Each structure stands twice: as C-alpha cells, then as structure tokens.
Amino acid sequence: GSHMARIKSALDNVSANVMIADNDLNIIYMNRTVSEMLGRAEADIRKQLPNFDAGRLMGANIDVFHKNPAHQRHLLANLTGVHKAELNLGGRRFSLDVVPVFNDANERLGSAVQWTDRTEEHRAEQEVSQLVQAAAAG
C-alpha cells in the first residue's frame, strides 16, 4: 500500500535512527540515518552478533538478533502504546523506543523502533555508580 510511500517521504532523511518491522518481524523499512550508522558499526556489532550482516537487512527477520526472540515476539504482539528500553549494540549503548504502526484502515503494519545513542551518559553513570560504591566502603 501507499503507507510505504508516506513513510519514506517523512522519515528517509530525518535526524533519527528509524526502522520498522512487519507483523512477522521482517524489516520492511530503515531510514538513511540508521542505515549509515549500522554500516559503520557492523564489525563492532559482529563481535556481539556474528550473524549481523548490515547489507542483508531489508527483508531480514529480527529474531536472529534477539536473545530469546520469543520475548520480543510476545512483547510486540501486545504493544499498545510506546515501549522504552535500552540495548547494547556493538559495545555502544542505545535507548530504544518502540511504537506499533497502523495504516489508514487501522490495520497494524508492524512496529517502529527508534535508537538513540547514549553511550557517554551510560559510561558516566557506570563511573559515578562505582565511584559512589567505592566511596561508601573503601
């Protein structure tokens, strides 16, 4: 359907990482920003997920990527509003934001995930964290 055209228009060049999987968890869209970023980080990511091929991403099922794919599968299948969480990707830390997406006829197209790098914030936290616990007890 032409939902796909509207999507490319609105997101293709926006500043955010954006990716969409269908109801089968098949990647059916990814914007330029996220495409560039996953390109660079491929080797680093491969250390974590040996199967990750950046160039083989469209069409891909994202189960491969998930520790227990059954868990996202359920999660997604019930998502109603936004889900907020974090992931490690290639030793970098991202906040992830997932929302379901629907066509004009309110059918569910799938799920939109948006990744925001927060590696620095996250390392800082780790520091302050151990620094505090070190101080509290020599």
**Which residues contact ligand CYN (rule: CB under 6 A)?**
87, 96, 113
Closest approach of ligand HEM to the CB of residue 113, in Å: 4
Closest approach of ligand HEM to the CB of residue 126, in Å: 18
Strand order in the sheet with 27-30: 27-30, 17-22, 108-117, 92-102, 83-89
According to the binding rule CB under 6 A, does residue 18 interact with ligand HEM?
Answer: no
State the Cα–Cα distance between residues 50 and 132, nearest whole angstrom: 36
According to the binding rule CB under 6 A, does residue 109 interact with ligand HEM?
Answer: no
- What is the Cα 2 distance to its own chain's centre? 24
Judged by beta carbon distances under 5 to 8 A according to partner kind, the member of ligand HEM, its own copies, ligand CYN, none in contact with residue 21 is ligand HEM
Q: Of 6 and 14, which CB lies nearer to ligand CYN in the complex structure?
A: 14
Site residues, its own copies (CB under 8 A): 3, 6-7, 9-11, 14-16, 18, 20, 82, 84, 86, 95, 97, 99, 101-106, 109, 112, 114, 116, 118, 121, 124-125, 128-129, 131-138
Q: Is 83 annotated to bind ligand?
A: no
Question: Is the four-CA dihedral 47, 15, 57, 20 of positive or negative sign?
Answer: positive
The CA-based dihedral angle spanning residues 66, 85, 56, 119, taken in that order and rounded to the nearest 10 degrees: -120
Cα-atom radius of gyration of the chain, to the nearest Å?
Answer: 17
Residues placed in the known binding site for heme: 66
